[PDB]
Amino acid sequence: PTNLCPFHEVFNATRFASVYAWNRTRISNCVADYSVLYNFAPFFAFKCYGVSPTKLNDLCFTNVYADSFVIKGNEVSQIAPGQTGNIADYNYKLPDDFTGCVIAWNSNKLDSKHSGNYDYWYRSFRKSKLKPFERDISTEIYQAGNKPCKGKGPNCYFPLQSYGFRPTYGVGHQPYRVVVLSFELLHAPATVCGPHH
């Protein structure tokens, strides 16, 4: 297995998924250099759970999963096991047994325009909480009241929302690009393996 895992191109990507409709790419059958990741190095969060940023390039796993999206600065604290908030409750929840790594770098000069990047969205309303790795792209009007509903009327809200992304926002509201790497030990031959094993 000599071809080198395409980790670069999850990160290197003109536009990211909206957290509510977060992407996933399956790294399957290759040698795994976590090195490229530092071609986006200025990192605001680099938190591993189960393995160590200083021990990637030695990880032998059956599979790797790379989930990507755009979030507020504030909300990066929510991409962690056992966390609570809109982004983990209705958009992207992780298992408590998570083995993987959350990676998060600032993306203002790309994802923020002087007139609001309203092409970014998150789910602010849901009847109940997503389970880990659940994903939900409904646009049904949320019904707050016992009463019936109508389009974005009262007691009856449009379910998603859009971050105004503009350069003068303070850092906690700027756009951040997030990549969760999930390391999968299955019972099968391990074919995402690192340079140093």
Binding site: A144, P154, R166, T168, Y169, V171, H173
Partner: protein, 593 residues
């Protein structure tokens, strides 16, 4: 049941997008005054208030007597309050044109000198300069009367139409008048005796003014004495100080008479401007010093956007800019300060003040949109100034290196310091209270407009002890020649603030366990004091300001005691100074006019 939490949650998230828009537009106007940016401001304001209207009615549908979460109840009451949404269509844009016009007049007005008629000159930078240095009665007088003649006369008709519309909006919000809307800031709904009804404020002001009044009076007599030495025939030894002879262009702070009134002139200087001049300071260093003081106590430093987006120098671009110092929270961790900071000690302390605002705004950003305010207008200003009280002690000035290091400590220099402090703190109290009281009257209908300035100068003479140099008919609108009056800012804050301060500093000095006089206390390098204060700046308006007070000082209302005790040595000295003097003023003599 509580679909209130949900409605409020959608509201928070739209309203902060829209309020950032409005704030940016207002900023872009305040730092680049053009026709175009004026109109882009009008359009941002239109969208804000069109939005707030629907959200306000939509909220009035949730009964506030079913809400038991006092937090959500404070939010829902804030929102059931339809400020601006009260005025409507023609009258929301009419108001806004009136307001833009007053604003651009105030910050574009130029007055010329009879001596060199080709010398027209602006207030925000230059006429201020004259009013701070000069000691020429006729020079000062032509600048004072020229400002009031050439802008106050331009503002009069505007102030009138402004008062009718602002009052209409207040009545539409179920207030007696606009002055009842502004005093509603001090209204709080908690429990036991943590409530506060608007109509207490006027009592509670008038109580404290009385307790302040003796001290002011003595300071007044003394300042008159020294001013007689520089203007012998223009000032009576028993009457009033002329209005154009004080620290600045109004009688607001007496902090430019220190030179004329320094008790023991042959000693280390409390004013420290000369020092900065030779110490080669600039705007960026004054603010880096404010920043260091706030970190020294344990507060955040300033954001990058604060440095990359604020106005600290007056722009040399050709750009025309409203220069009055203001601290902006544009709702998104987008904090700025708009100030034309010049290298003096006065700007150094005001950088302390306006950064104290920014620090409060950063502090309560954990709170939901509708609760991100001060506990009351005063607290926001007060916080700016508590730090200042410490930033200003000689001991700290010495630590800065701005004083000469050598230890010439003595009551002598403590009297020097207490007087420079009285000139700015105590001096401003009657001017402030009298200004707001005039406005409260004008709003309540008690002054016919055929007697506006008649009741201005009358209250001036009676309450402040200040008389006018030339007579002013109702073609003037002097009161509007101040930023706050013509730029629609509540003014009684600068009263409550001055009292709330010594209540805070005293408490925050007890924490630092500073022994001895409250006026030699300095909370620098005191992380426990910073912690004491931040715990309550983190509340904002989420709790009754009365409890917010008790949380740090142990009072539920204002208390002149710490202020009086801070200035007590100066009271004793000043009293001696006026043993063979009349401690008071009479509105009989005039200065020819």
């Amino acid at each position: 049941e509580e679909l209130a939490k949900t409605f409020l949650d959608k509201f928070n998230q739209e309203a902060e997008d829209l309020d950032h828009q409005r704030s940016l537009a207002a900023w872009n106007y305040n730092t680049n005054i053009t026709k175009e940016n004026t109109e882009k401001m009008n359009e941002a304001e239109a969208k804000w208030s069109a939005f707030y209207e629907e959200q306000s009615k939509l909220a009035k549908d949730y009964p506030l007597q079913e809400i038991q979460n006092f937090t959500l109840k404070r939010q829902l009451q804030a929102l059931q309050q339809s400020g601006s949404s009260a005025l409507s269509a023609n009258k929301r844009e009419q108001l806004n044109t009136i307001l833009n016009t007053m604003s651009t007049i105030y910050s574009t007005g130029k007055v010329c000198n009879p001596k060199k008629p080709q010398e027209c000159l602006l207030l925000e930078p230059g006429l201020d300069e004259i009013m701070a240095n000069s000691t020429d009665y006729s020079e000062r007088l032509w600048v004072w009367e020229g400002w009031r003649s050439e802008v106050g006369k331009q503002l009069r008709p505007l102030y009138e139409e402004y008062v009718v519309l602002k009052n209409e909006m207040a009545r539409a919000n179920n207030y007696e008048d606009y002055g009842d809307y502004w005093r509603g800031d001090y209204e709080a709904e908690g429990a036991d005796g943590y409530g506060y009804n608007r109509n207490q404020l006027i009592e509670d002001v008038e109580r404290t003014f009385a307790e302040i009044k003796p001290l002011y009076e003595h300071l007044h007599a003394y300042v008159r004495a020294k001013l007689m030495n520089t203007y012998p025939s223009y000032i009576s030894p028993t009457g009033c100080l002329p209005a154009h002879l004080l620290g600045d262009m109004w009688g607001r702070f007496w902090t430019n008479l220190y030179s004329l009134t320094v008790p023991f002139p042959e000693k280390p200087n409390i004013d420290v401007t000369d020092a900065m001049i030779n110490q080669n300071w600039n705007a960026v260093r004054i603010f880096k010093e404010a920043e260091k003081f706030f970190v020294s106590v344990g507060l955040p430093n300033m954001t990058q956007g604060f440095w990359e987006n604020s106005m600290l120098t007056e722009p040399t671009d050709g750009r025309k800019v409203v220069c009055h110092p203001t601290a902006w929270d544009l709702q998104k961790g987008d904090f700025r300060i708009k100030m034309c900071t010049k290298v003096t000690m006065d700007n150094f302390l005001t950088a302390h003040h306006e950064m104290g605002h920014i620090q409060y705004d950063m502090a309560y950003a954990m709170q939901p949109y509708l609760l991100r305010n001060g506990a009351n207008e005063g607290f926001h200003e007060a916080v700016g100034e508590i730090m200042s009280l410490s930033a200003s002690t000689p001991k700290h000035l010495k630590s800065i290196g701005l004083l000469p290091s050598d230890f010439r400590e003595d009551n002598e220099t403590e009297i020097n310091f207490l007087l420079k402090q009285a000139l700015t703190i105590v001096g401003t109290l009657p001017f402030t209270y009298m200004l707001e009281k005039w406005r409260w009257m004008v709003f309540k209908g008690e002054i016919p407009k055929d007697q506006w300035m008649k009741k201005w100068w009358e209250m001036k003479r009676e309450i402040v002890g200040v008389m006018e140099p030339v007579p002013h008919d109702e073609t003037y609108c002097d009161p509007a020649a101040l930023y706050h009056v013509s730029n629609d800012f509540s003014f009684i804050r600068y009263y409550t603030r001055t009292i709330y301060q010594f209540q805070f500093q005293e408490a925050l000095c007890q924490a630092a366990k500073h022994e001895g006089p409250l006026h030699k206390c300095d909370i620098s390098n005191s992380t426990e004091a910073g912690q004491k204060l931040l715990n309550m700046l983190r509340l904002g308006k989420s709790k009754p300001w009365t409890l917010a007070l008790e949380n740090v000082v142990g009072a539920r209302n204002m208390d002149v005691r710490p202020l009086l005790n801070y200035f007590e040595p100066l009271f004793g000295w000043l009293k001696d100074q006026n043993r063979n003097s009349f401690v008071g003023w009479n509105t009989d003599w005039s200065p020819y006019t």
